[model samples]
Target: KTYQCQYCEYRSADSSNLKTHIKTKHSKEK
Candidate 1:
């Protein structure tokens, strides 16, 4: 299963990319 990004169309099958993506991209965060 692919995990979707927090606030964008980005998704990843691996957590490695997912963590980086969220940190820089979705990093406006909560």
Candidate 2:
């Protein structure tokens, strides 16, 4: 499945990656 960050249009394969991406990526801004 494909998951997206709530902050931006990032592409993550699952919730795991999505949160991780959001945590690091979104912290500074998408």
Candidate 3:
């Protein structure tokens, strides 16, 4: 599945990576 940021529209091929992105970048969890 493709993971995308709800706030910034950033996308990732892996949900795990996207999850980390949200955590680190946004300081929150998806």
Candidate 4:
């Protein structure tokens, strides 16, 4: 299974890692 980000084109094999990526990578921009 794969998890994709709704905000951008970021993707990860683990959904939990995807969430962390968003919070640390994307959310920090705002």
TM-score (all chains, Cα) for each model: 0.58, 0.57, 0.66, 0.69
Estimate the TM-score for candidate 1.
Answer: 0.58
List pairs with backbone clashes in candidate 2. none
lDDT (0 to 1) per candidate: 0.83, 0.78, 0.83, 0.90
Provide the lDDT at 24 for model 3: 83
On residues 1-30, what C-alpha lDDT tens digit does candidate 1 reach at each position? 788877788889998888889898767756
User: Candidate 1, after superposition: displacement of residue 8 in Å?
Assistant: 0.8
Candidate 2 total steric clashes: 0
Model 4 lDDT, full chain set: 0.90
Per-residue alpha-carbon lDDT of candidate 4 for residues 1-30, written as tens digits (9 for 90 to 100): 998999989899988999999998888767
lDDT of 3 by residue, 1-30 (tens): 687899677899988888888888897545
Q: After superposition, how far is residue 10 of candidate 2 from its true place, in Å?
A: 0.3
> How far in Å is the alpha carbon of 17 misplaced in model 2?
0.6
- Candidate 4 shows a clash count of 0
Report the candidate with higher TM-score, 2 versus 3: 3
List of clashing residue pairs for candidate 1: none
Evaluated at residue 26, the lDDT of candidate 4 is 85
**Prediction 3 TM-score vs. true:** 0.66
Residue 22 of model 3 has an lDDT of: 82
